[PDB]
Design an enzyme around this catalytic site. Structure first.
Site, PDB file in Angstrom:
ATOM      1  N   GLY A   9       0.801  -1.204   0.000  1.00 54.87           N
ATOM      2  CA  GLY A   9       0.000   0.000   0.000  1.00 54.87           C
ATOM      3  C   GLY A   9       0.837   1.259   0.000  1.00 54.87           C
ATOM      4  CB  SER A  48       3.431  -2.256  -2.681  1.00 58.65           C
ATOM      5  OG  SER A  48       2.719  -2.177  -3.900  1.00 58.65           O
ATOM      6  CG  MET A  49       5.049   0.031   1.359  1.00 59.76           C
ATOM      7  SD  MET A  49       6.721   0.657   1.185  1.00 59.76           S
ATOM      8  CE  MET A  49       6.653   0.847  -0.560  1.00 59.76           C
ATOM      9  CG  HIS A 109       4.663  -2.299  -9.772  1.00 58.50           C
ATOM     10  ND1 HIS A 109       3.326  -2.070  -9.997  1.00 58.50           N
ATOM     11  CD2 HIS A 109       5.330  -1.504 -10.630  1.00 58.50           C
ATOM     12  CE1 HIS A 109       3.190  -1.164 -10.938  1.00 58.50           C
ATOM     13  NE2 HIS A 109       4.403  -0.808 -11.343  1.00 58.50           N
ATOM     14  CG  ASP A 158       2.685  -4.362 -12.852  1.00 53.54           C
ATOM     15  OD1 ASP A 158       2.808  -3.430 -13.679  1.00 53.54           O
ATOM     16  OD2 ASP A 158       1.992  -4.271 -11.815  1.00 53.54           O
TER      17      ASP A 158
END
Lengths: 177, 6, 169, 174, 172, 176, 172, 6, 171, 171, 173, 177, 172, 6, 6, 6, 6, 6, 6, 6
Positions: free
Chosen positions: K62, K91-92, K116, K154
């Site tokens: 997020g 992500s994170m 990504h 991605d």
């Protein structure tokens, strides 16, 4: 409130349409994507109808996002007509930028107007950094001021009179009549 | 707001 | 809103150079009224314009936009208080052409201007008070006392205060 | 609100009325309806300054500011304003029907009328408005000022027959 | 909008200008296609300006607009006004060669979001289709179009001029 | 905004889609429900009453909702005398694809990058009746066997313009 | 959105009502009932002799409203020809059969359904009986089958409904 | 509201 | 936002009631008035001798509720210490003034607002009550209370001690 | 539902018993009352042991934050302020007003020091006061404070350390 | 509904996993989720600063600001944080996985890792991005340029591909 | 209400009661919250008593591949055997977890149903084919069926009774008596 | 009505209350309660009161299979309304202990009925007859009339359901 | 309402 | 806030 | 739908 | 879409 | 997930 | 579900 | 409120 209507010669305009008929664009609300689309379309329209004649842009706006404002600015710059700007009541953030981006010698403000060039009142940060460096630069060039004065005023809520906006270079003339 | 804009 | 024959009401009034200010003064109302004033002024720069007011007030910058427009155009802008003129509605009433500012018998006027940049709002209040002191003829201290408090003016009290020039009957 | 076409262009149902110089008052009285009614009074008095103006009314009232705007506009204009109650006229509605020209304050055979008026030193200014109303209708009903003060502090019935004893109307229609 | 009796976008349509200032969906696609067909029928010689300020949209809608641009006779100039991304960027590059424009502070995003489980071949069909068209419009080799559409970087107008996406930057 | 207005001197203000309807073009650019069906049907009937000779065009960009609504349009296309040319704009799926192939033989088209999904929507006996009927008329419109249609209708299925042409759903791809 | 045709700027439907065609394409509530009864009344007032076409694509709905429609259908001078164009369930089927004897029409792929809403109090049932009473007298069938079929979900095709008597003629 | 505005 | 404390458990504002502290961080309506009155009473019933601290950070409320609180404070035997923490405005300022003489505390920088809220002939009378009571507790003339209460006016931990609103500041 | 609820015994109360309170939201009167109550309770538990106030707030009200300021200035425990992700307006003010040597921040946190007739005089007095305190807590001259608190500018952990807002960065 | 265990002590699940120093990051990351697990990290460091903490990851990631809050609270605390991917890590989530105790970064056989990054106050975003790529390279051991290319793209990595990339240290069975 | 409470000093919700005796419910669509809960339950049960087995009662339409695979990997990792009982509906990923139980410990009730259709009706295309092939691989192992018949039946909408599932090799026994 | 609420005190007395439509959540809860009451005491019977308008076949068949699996004999009582699967579970109560209250109703009709494919309509055919072939066993009725009466939506009072075999006794 | 309003 | 309240 | 309705 | 529909 | 996480 | 699960 | 209620 609703907006009046007028009947000229036998066509019925609404008030801002009658203003558009004489090449006046009314930017009188916060600048978002839809308002930017509206202003850009009115500019393109007037430029298409008569590329040589002059367009006027009346401003009474607290501003908005830098991206929408820059759309409007680039459209002013590229179209063949030169755009005069006038400050009706309040030209803040991107509204102030668009006021100062008017044709030299043809940027105006009413006596009790106010100007505030505070630029703001995640995949895009570089582009927002790219758009932020351009705004300060264009303001510096348009007002004759050094860039370090601009950066200092576009970072704080510094309200300016019409006489102060004149001494700053944002406008060229205070309308009185 | 003429004269002079327009 | 009714319609006559074909103009809708209010717009019909606009055909004879009459502008309606029956709502609070936000920036939309101000832009509309400014455009109307400029249109009337461009059609016939000589003939008088009428501004009918029934407002509880609104934004200072919006009201001052209307004020500046009234001051820039050539025609004279008479003003009338139909029922209520508070805050910037009262300011705009007193801003009408001296001699041509009217009010109805039971219309009221409130000059109180209630509310941030301290320096700025102090300047805006000072400017409003200067202009009011000029439009009415009261000394500055009286205006400063009465635009800072909440107060009510009958049509007669507003006549003798200097805000209007004649009660319509 | 149906629409009507006349030999063309069209207008809603309340505009044919205005064409024959009839003004409707079917809603509560705030600033917006007051502004419109005042404008209608003016337009009618401008197209023909001698012909009569009918005011058809059916409201639960409103507030003093808006209704008094309508009132002062009724008293201002030259064409005498006929007034007629149709359903219910209450608070400022009753008052502005009372405000009708003498001899031309009509009411339908049964339509109530209600005169009870609306609910820090600025508040010292509150008595003054009701006092104004007590003055004017008292001099328009033809009745004592005290049968007008106590009687207006509380809700009270009426009828098209009682409205004629109280000087509220002038005739009835059948 | 700002209307008479007939708003601003309709007066624009009257001057052969189509504005795409919104995300591309089926409604927008039907509208743009109808306007292109109508302008082409009204005059097949004069050109058509398509100004783009879009964050993108579906492949289907975008290819409807693209196929219509290819079918009609009038030459369709395209102009990036602030942002052309995904199918907006694709439609930007799909304008008449020589009349693809961008404004100085524009941005172009090449990345086209991808989209039963073995119907996934559809994805595989659409992607390379897009790429192969882009490679033609830009003159870039296909091997770099495959690499740059895969990532979500953004190109300023200047660094999209040498790429072949637009042909000229309109200035004062 | 979204839907512009065209005006013509006579004085007349159309919406862009009504302007196309003037020249006998009907838009099917949304999911098919009963409101859409009733409008399409009315447009077909009106157009067939103006000039029974000249043909009509049905531009399709729909995901194809309802069998009842689509068959209402289908029956209206069969009954009217004018020929109903058909053009797939972006997406002819489900019942939209059905109406695509239901057009007059020789007058079914699709744009190079159009897509066609013939997977058909969603008492048990009524369902089987409707399925059989759709497969019947589809097989007649494509020339394909009833069996291959029976299979390619029951499960999800994508087709490019070239593949739809190969299958018998359209008659040509618009070129130039 | 609803398209429009053309001094005479007619909306669709309004252009079909111009030639005495009423469109019952929606479900039935108080408003819809009132909507088409006024159309029937207006057409009968504009011409009591000429007949009215009633196109039906309704899944039915409220019994109280459908009954109002049917009763307004009977007493008016003109004779209402009912044409099923897609669906005719609950009160839609009933209104279809109630059309002019001989002039009831359907479309090859249109369906008709008779399963009336099961539900104030003695009123509803009375209606249902008066509903089952005239259905027979319109189809030509005995009551027991009518009743047993109305408490069950049975879809009838254009052919089956022709054998049942619900309909007179199929269009082709 | 004339005479006299306007 | 309010945490629990285990000593059974109760929310943070109940440790305070256990040690005879009553919280007043919200605007004063009927509900908070009833709760505060009930807390005052419970505290005065557990130990009618020990002090009762009233911590207050309120923008005010209305006269009826705040006055219920006041009457209760005056009625009970234990002396109610009062202390301003963030802001004491309208009935909050009054109820801070209503504290026990010598035990009206305030924190170094925290404003105090005496401007009061807005058959109607009765309204004045309510205001008249307030001007009477705080006047006999600030120690100041009535008129300098009446006009100073008709309009919004600033204050401070130091100005409130000159006005007789509080007694000490804490450092 | 509440977050790690033991059985309502959530993570933040578990933290409060370890003398570490958490400010992770805008600062209004609710959060203010709760934090001041927690500090007071934590100083009654042990007057000498340290408390660690963690800050992730994007700003708040002057009245609320000042209540918190006076509170942690009143009690005895040293209050270590620790910026986690962001500390704006009164968040930065409370961070800088921690305990000298104990004001911490995280490598990638960011700190905004900008703070957003009678009414004008009040706003003026308040801004002047917080500028005086900031100049005293950072060591900067008053003039540069009056400048840098007029403009919206983010300071990274090292900018805030080189400014005097914090004392140490943790890693 | 969330089940509970009972050993005098009436624990909720997660609370019972936190009792043995296990934090669960199974949601997307926003300000509240950051607030929630930084407090768990601080609580576990205050209850025992020597013993390690385990961090199960099943998040699509997020906000970058919130994830960096979590990472920075993971770095300075005394105990070492082991990160175990149990399903998804995007992500994170991916970044927080690779930021674990060197040697004690784990993944499950069919778990997936997606690096990504996206999916005023703008100067702070790209500084966070540069710090992100810097420490991603210093944790995998891979060139920076490749990392920057891959974080704009991605790319789903199975447990084996993420092990061969340097994002994880050991697969669990 | 819906979820009652069972008391013994100790007040359980009925599902927590079942968890006491090593019963985990999967009576809902599998999203990542469900997966995290199931994983934690499995791990805790495997720490209390690594020897006694665990039962997973299933009544799910089977949502997410990633979530289901998290549960699958947790089942493989832990020491105890995971018995699996289809209550009413094991569809999509729920059926996958059904067959993923210990051979000899996979049950269904007489009127249970099993849908092995793992679907996303019309996203990185290679990842999708990878996940599909993996599902088919392990399903083939758990049933003994050829990879081709699984490849075909896993891609189409497939309904199965308790007996059909037992025949297919998805379960080992149907609960009787 | 809490003290540990009423329905939980009822569970303590081996009573399970079904006063809501049957869905997967209801079914999981009822199954857990049946399993618990059985594992605690497999000899004492279990009351199941039914006031449900119905539900999905899957949920109710889960409850049915759990009734059949457990030793304790499960009595069922229609309190006001048992429709669709409520009625099925009513008749599925252990024989002799299927009760109904005098003014209660039993609707046998099970609305026909996961599937994104039309040929998977056989499932409905399978789930319908599977229900009927159980009902025909629970009531003693021939399968012909069970197939006839589940097809229609008629409702049976407590008395005209006693001679039908749904319930055994009417409690007065 | 004529006669007499109008 | 002790000393002194409490 | 003519001929014949209308 | 002509030539040729229409 | 022990041994060894924890 | 015992005997035998559990 | 005691004395006297209670």
């Amino acid at each position: 409130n609703l907006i009046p209507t007028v009947i000229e010669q036998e066509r019925a305009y609404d008030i801002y349409s009658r203003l558009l008929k004489d090449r006046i664009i009314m930017l009188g609300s916060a600048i978002d994507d839809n308002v930017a689309n509206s202003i850009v379309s009115q500019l393109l329209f007037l430029a298409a109808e008569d590329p040589e004649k002059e367009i006027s842009l009346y401003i009474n706006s607290p501003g908005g996002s830098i991206t929408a404002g820059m759309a409007i600015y680039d459209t002013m710059q590229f179209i063949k007509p030169k755009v005069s700007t006038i400050c009706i009541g309040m030209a803040a953030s991107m509204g102030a930028f668009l006021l100062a981006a008017g044709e030299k010698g043809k940027r105006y403000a009413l006596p009790n107007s106010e100007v505030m060039i505070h630029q703001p009142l995640e995949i895009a940060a570089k582009r927002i950094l790219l758009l932020r460096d351009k705004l300060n630069k264009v303001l510096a060039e348009r007002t004759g001021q050094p860039l370090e004065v601009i950066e200092r005023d576009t970072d704080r809520d510094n309200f300016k009179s019409a006489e102060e906006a004149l001494e700053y270079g944002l406008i060229d003339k205070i309308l009185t009549h | 707001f003429s004269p002079x804009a327009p």
